[PDB]
């Protein structure tokens, strides 16, 4: 399996309700392992998976120190951007930062990411070369010139290709029982088909990990129904993921159609058909 | 592990 580590930062200004709300979460693949919320009592980075609890007091002091320096950067940024965009002090505004690294099944570097948004839109993004910037508009071009002059891309390259991949590798080892698990989806079939000529068949997938899955509906051959009705993959809340896909068929031709479930943890691709 | 470099103001 390929793997990723990602950190997600949100700050929201709230004039006359004091300092920006700041929330940080870390992920390994689809498992959250840390967070910081400026409104909680701890004022600390806190564990959110059992395998990060192995880390000693220096980890938690360090990540607390660093997450607050990130928070302080966003506070300044919210002020700066109100200036760049000529905005009042009245409104709530959002800054977002995402960064991290992907590795392949050999756990070697594939790709690095460092991206910033303002009010839900792209502001500045590190390109795949880990030295070029995409600036969304005139304001982001000011930021671009400042971050070029200071060699921000060179600093990020050192973390993205080095630090990020080896701490990802450390987490994948220490959390081996969670993170390298592959829970195959428990599947089944529902027939909710209360039309005269037409039946609708939903093909279910519960308790799987990771969240990556494919729910093809097939017919006689072809393989395709561009008319499938699949809900966004959702958290079960226990650390596993749920999904289904739906196709509308004739009430006669019940058992001419096949659900093709694909998951990393299934030896062979499953293949389900309406059983009375 | 968080970045400890490459975090500057916009």
């Amino acid at each position, epitope marked *: 399996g390929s793997h990723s580590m990602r950190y997600f930062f949100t700050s929201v200004s709230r004039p006359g309700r004091g300092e920006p709300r700041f929330i940080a979460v870390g992920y390994v693949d689809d498992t959250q392992f840390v967070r910081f919320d400026s409104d909680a009592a701890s004022q600390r980075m806190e564990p959110r998976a059992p395998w990060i609890e192995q880390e000693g007091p220096e980890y938690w*002091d360090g990540e607390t120190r660093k997450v607050k320096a990130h928070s302080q950067t966003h506070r300044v940024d919210l002020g700066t951007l109100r200036g760049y965009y000529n905005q009042s002090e009245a409104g709530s505004h959002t800054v977002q930062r995402m960064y991290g690294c992907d590795v392949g099944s050999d756990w070697r570097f594939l790709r690095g990411y460092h991206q910033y948004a303002y009010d839900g839109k792209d502001y500045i993004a590190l390109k795949e070369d880990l030295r070029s910037w995409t600036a969304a508009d005139m304001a982001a071009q000011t930021t671009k010139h400042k971050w070029e002059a200071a060699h921000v891309a*060179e600093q990020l390259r050192a973390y993205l290709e080095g630090t990020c991949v080896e701490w990802l590798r450390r987490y994948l080892e220490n959390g081996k029982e969670t993170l390298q698990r592959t829970d195959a989806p428990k599947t089944h079939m529902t027939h909710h088909a209360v039309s005269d000529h037409e039946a609708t068949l939903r093909c279910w997938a519960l308790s799987f990990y990771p969240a990556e899955i494919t729910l093809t509906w097939q017919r006689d051959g072809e393989d395709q129904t561009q008319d499938t009705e699949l809900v966004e993959t959702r958290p079960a809340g226990d650390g596993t993921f749920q999904k289904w896909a739906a196709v509308v068929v004739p009430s006669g031709q019940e058992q001419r159609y096949t659900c093709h479930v694909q998951h990393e943890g299934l030896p062979k691709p499953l293949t389900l058909r309406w059983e009375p | 592990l968080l970045l*400890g470099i490459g975090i500057l103001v916009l």
Partner: T-cell receptor
Amino acid sequence: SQTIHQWPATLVQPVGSPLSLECTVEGTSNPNLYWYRQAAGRGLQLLFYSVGIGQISSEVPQNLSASRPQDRQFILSSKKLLLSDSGFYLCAWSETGLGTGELFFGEGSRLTVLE
Amino acid sequence: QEVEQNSGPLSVPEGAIASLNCTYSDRGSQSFFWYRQYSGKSPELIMFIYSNGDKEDGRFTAQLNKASQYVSLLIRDSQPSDSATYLCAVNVAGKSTFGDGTTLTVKP
């Protein structure tokens, strides 16, 4: 342009006296501010770290205290100095956030406490 | 110990290359510093490095190896005025951790 001044430069004080060291930076805003001490050798113990105005992180249980009443104003104090508070006290700033992490030091405050 | 450098004093003849070394134990460290400190004075940055390999700036070359966990400083063509305490530092845990210094005397 960018500037860090600390005061006083040298102090000789009796055990039990109060301490006030001041540090001032010009030509930057929202800096990280640090108090380090050099005692019983070279190399630097972090005493206080401040990520921003009003925010003081104490890095060792100690007889000293720090405050940052404005952006560019960092203060180190004690009500009752001990013999063991003797040292070279260094104020430093770094750019807002986590850049290269280069520290700009003040010219330092040399404190001798005498019985 | 987090940042280890020999105390010296390290004696080097005028015109020879001084070799300063530093090891760090925390693999979370993401940049690396040499500061110079004259007796009585405050530390002053010689250079920083955050990429594996060598970085040259005139007479000074920093070397970083994140696999071995070592930072070196080489001073070409050493002068008596380079006599100082050289402080190795590591940016880890959102702050600079300092070594206890290497004292260098360049004999004229």
